[PDB]
Every structure is written in structure tokens, then in C-alpha cells.
């Protein structure tokens, strides 16, 4: 990724929004940007809240969405303009309508420009619209899970990652993280009681991708082995990257 200290960067808090949909995405001494998102099928609706932390009204308040050319073909974002004048202490809301066309890895960038005290202010932050947001959890019996797991033939469709735990192995937190990620969390499927098994379908306009995941904790080494088996190589890769950063 991008080298150097990531503090005051465009992605300081991006990671906290992969498994949850609400929270403060960015905050400086003048503005606070909060989010509330909801997804269904291959669609999403993200409410962006711009809070004026001062006692002075902002002018020319202009939020613009910026997506790489490649991203634009896989993700369609639409929004209505917000009023350019924001009173001090006020919070204005912007709604972004999202339509996932095909699977994607990049993230849109929200750029906000405004005038405060006669000065030009500029902020750019990555919006947490990630592939997993388009998940439909799919509950299924142990037998059905194993039958599907064993239907994978393409080696590219399986992605494994063995990594060090960033957080304590708190069972309940882990279960909550997996459910927040988007897939169904299947209870009592893997013969080893320490492992977590998940299943879901990633929805896009052009294709529906069945996904299976297995998370195996190594308590002594404080490491995890995450395996993704999906019907599309690029989805297995993206989902494995995203989920690995959460434990």
C-alpha cells in the first residue's frame, strides 16, 4: 500500500468501516464526517453527515465523489447536491446511492472543499464502500457447506492467508466481526470447535458470486489461517484481503 505514517491521511479510519456501517469517518478542527450506510442486494445507500464544529458558517461547501476510471465501470455512485452554506454547529446530510456493477477493489474518494473565515479548506478521504457490503448471508447445513466447499476446482478461486492476530482472540468479538463482514456465520460445521465457517453470495449487477470462508485460529502462535473459496478469483482475493485486516 501507500508507504509512510498514515495519520492525517485519506485512510486513517477506513478499516473501521469494513465490518460496520456507522461511525465517524474523519474529523479535523473544523469538520466532522460521519457515516450511516445500508445495503441490499447489489445496492447501497450511504448517508454522509458533515458537521460544522465551529461557530462560523462555511461557504462554497462542495463534496465531490472521485473514482478511478476502472472503478467507475464497476461501481456506480449517484448523489444530490448539498447546500453550499453550512451554519456553525450545523450538520448537513448527503445521500450517496450505490450500485455495484461488478466486483471491485478500489475505493471512491470523497473530496470536500469549502470556505471558512475567508480561507479555502480541502479534505480528501476514502469512502468505505467495500465488496463485502454486497453480501447476502446464506445459512446452510454442515453437509451442504462441505458439498459446496468441495465443488471448487480452479486453484485461483481459493485464497489463503496465514497472519498474526492484531486483536485478542475474543470469541464473541470474532463472531461479531464475521457477521458484520456480511456472510452467514455457520455454527458447528467445522469439526474443530475453534474454527469459524461462513457462507454468502456477493451480489453485483453482472454476476452473483458464491463465497465460502474458513477462519482457523492458532492460539499458541496467536495467528489465523483464513481461506476463501468463491466462484470468482478476484472476489476470493479481495475478500481475503479485507477480512484478514480485521482480526
Curated annotation (Swiss-Prot):
It is found in: Cell membrane; Membrane, Coated pit. Changing residue 146 to A: Reduces SNAP91, AMPH and BIN1 binding. Abolishes AMPH and SNAP91 binding. Abolishes EPN1 and EPS15 binding. Expressed in the brain (at protein level). Component of the adaptor protein complex 2 (AP-2). Adaptor protein complexes function in protein transport via transport vesicles in different membrane traffic pathways. Adaptor protein complexes are vesicle coat components and appear to be involved in cargo selection and vesicle formation. AP-2 is involved in clathrin-dependent endocytosis in which cargo proteins are incorporated into vesicles surrounded by clathrin (clathrin-coated vesicles, CCVs) which are destined for fusion with the early endosome. Adaptor protein complex 2 (AP-2) is a heterotetramer composed of two large adaptins (alpha-type subunit AP2A1 or AP2A2 and beta-type subunit AP2B1), a medium adaptin (mu-type subunit AP2M1) and a small adaptin (sigma-type subunit AP2S1). Binds EPN1, EPS15, AMPH, SNAP91 and BIN1. Interacts with clathrin. Interacts with HIP1. Interacts with DGKD. Interacts with DENND1A, DENND1B and DENND1C. Interacts with FCHO1 and DAB2. Interacts with ATAT1; this interaction is required for efficient alpha-tubulin acetylation by ATAT1. Interacts with KIAA1107. Belongs to the adaptor complexes large subunit family. This is AP-2 complex subunit alpha-2. It comes from Mus musculus (Mouse). The chain holds residues 697 to 938 of 938 of the full protein.
Amino acid at each position: 500500500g501507500s508507504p509512510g505514517i498514515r495519520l492525517g491521511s485519506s485512510e486513517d479510519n477506513f478499516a473501521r468501516f469494513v465490518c460496520k456501517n456507522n461511525g465517524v469517518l474523519f474529523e479535523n478542527q473544523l469538520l466532522q464526517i460521519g457515516l450511516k450506510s445500508e445495503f441490499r442486494q447489489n445496492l447501497g445507500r450511504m448517508f454522509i453527515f458533515y458537521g460544522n464544529k465551529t461557530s462560523t458558517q462555511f461557504l462554497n461547501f462542495t463534496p465531490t465523489l472521485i473514482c478511478a476510471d476502472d472503478l467507475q465501470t464497476n461501481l456506480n455512485l449517484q448523489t444530490k447536491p448539498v447546500d453550499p452554506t453550512v451554519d456553525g454547529g450545523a450538520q448537513v446530510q448527503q445521500v450517496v446511492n450505490i450500485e455495484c456493477i461488478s466486483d471491485f477493489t478500489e475505493a471512491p474518494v470523497l473530496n470536500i472543499q469549502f470556505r471558512y473565515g475567508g480561507t479555502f479548506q480541502n479534505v480528501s478521504v476514502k469512502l468505505p464502500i467495500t465488496l463485502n457490503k454486497f453480501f447476502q448471508p446464506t445459512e446452510m447445513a454442515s453437509q451442504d457447506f462441505f458439498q459446496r466447499w468441495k465443488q471448487l476446482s480452479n486453484p485461483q478461486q481459493e485464497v489463503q492467508n496465514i497472519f498474526k492476530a492484531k486483536h485478542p482472540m475474543d470469541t464473541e468479538i470474532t463472531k461479531a466481526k464475521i457477521i458484520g463482514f456480511g456472510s452467514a456465520l455457520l455454527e458447528e460445521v467445522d469439526p474443530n470447535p475453534a474454527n469459524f465457517v461462513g457462507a454468502g453470495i456477493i451480489h453485483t449487477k453482472t454476476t452473483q458470486i458464491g463465497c465460502l470462508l474458513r477462519l482457523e485460529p492458532n492460539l499458541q502462535a496467536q495467528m489465523y489461517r483464513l481461506t476463501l473459496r468463491t466462484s470468482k478469483d478476484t472476489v476470493s482475493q479481495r475478500l481475503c484481503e479485507l477480512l484478514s485486516e480485521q482480526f
